[PDB]
């Protein structure tokens, strides 16, 4: 129970792989700004996971033939992130 | 310069994420693709969060606002807590 709010609280403890400054730069570039540094860290982790999910998707393809990420395996993992389909 | 520094930072981030995912190598094109997608996703969150928070009467964005923004974007927030615990172990080299 409450696994999410537990995560949100200790965001101040986590140090994401992406520096706060870098995430901040790209957010401030989209016109978004936040003083709570936990907001920056939340966004950093979400962005990281977004890429991790793609990497894992790619790996699953690579397992369909010690591991090299190729465009052959990465391309299919991008199917949801192309041109906007109506 | 600053753009170079950012690109290098994201390269290392992507490198770490690929290493954690179980890759030992990667085609340059694939690293470049994910570096681009990473910075663009952060910006997308920013636009979405901006759009969302402009509806609230509070000057300061809240963590709650951002969670809702991610949901609006179709991000599965339920899985983040588990992911965050692994990431903390992660190392850059
Ligand atoms: Cl840039």
Query: Which residues, including other chains, have CB under 8 Å from residue B38's CB and lie 6 or more apart?
Result: A47, A50, A51, B10, B13, B14
> Which tokens belong to A3?
């696994």
For residues B18 and A34, give the distance between their C-alpha atoms in angstroms, rounded to a whole number: 29
- Residue among B2, B15, B20, B23 with most chain A CBs within 10 A, to mutate: B23
Of B22, B30, B37, the CB nearest to A71: B30
Per DSSP, B57 falls in state S
What is the DSSP track for A5-72?
Answer: HHHHHGGGT---SS-HHHHHHHHHHTT---S-HHHHHHHHHHHHHHHHHHHHHHHHHHT----EE-HH
Residue spans per domain, chain B: 1-93
A52 contacts B17? CB cut-off 8 A: yes
Q: Using CA atoms, how far apart are residues A58 and B67, in angstroms rounded to an integer?
A: 27
Strand partners, A68: B25
Which sign does the torsion angle of CA B78, A56, A12, B38 carry? Answer: negative
Superfamily of domain B1-93 in CATH is Histone, subunit A (1.10.20.10)
| Domain extent at residue A2 | 1-86
Listed resolution, Å: 1.9
Q: How much distance in Å is there from the Cα of B42 to the middle of ligand 1?
A: 11
Dist CA B7 CA A70 (whole Å): 21
Chain A nearest C-alpha distance from B51 (Å): 9
C-beta of residue B37 within 8 angstroms of C-beta of residue A51: yes
């Amino acid at each position: 129970s409450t696994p999410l709010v537990d995560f949100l609280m200790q965001l101040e403890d986590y140090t994401p792989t992406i520096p706060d400054a870098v995430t901040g730069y790209y957010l401030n570039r989209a016109g978004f700004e936040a003083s709570d540094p936990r907001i920056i860290r939340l966004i950093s982790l979400a962005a990281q996971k977004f890429i991790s999910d793609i990497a894992n998707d790619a790996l699953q393809h690579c397992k369909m033939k010690k591991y090299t990420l190729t465009m052959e395996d990465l391309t299919p993992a991008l199917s949801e992130y192309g041109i906007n389909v109506k | 310069n600053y753009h170079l520094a950012r690109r290098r930072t994201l390269q290392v981030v992507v490198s770490s994420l690929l290493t954690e995912a179980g890759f030992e190598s990667a085609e340059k094109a694939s690293v470049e693709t994910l570096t681009e997608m990473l910075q663009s996703y952060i910006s997308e969150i920013g636009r979405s969060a901006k759009s969302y928070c402009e509806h609230t009467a509070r000057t300061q964005p809240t963590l709650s606002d951002i969670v809702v923004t991610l949901v609006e974007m179709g991000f599965n927030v339920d899985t983040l807590p588990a992911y965050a615990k692994r990431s903390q172990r992660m190392v850059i080299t």
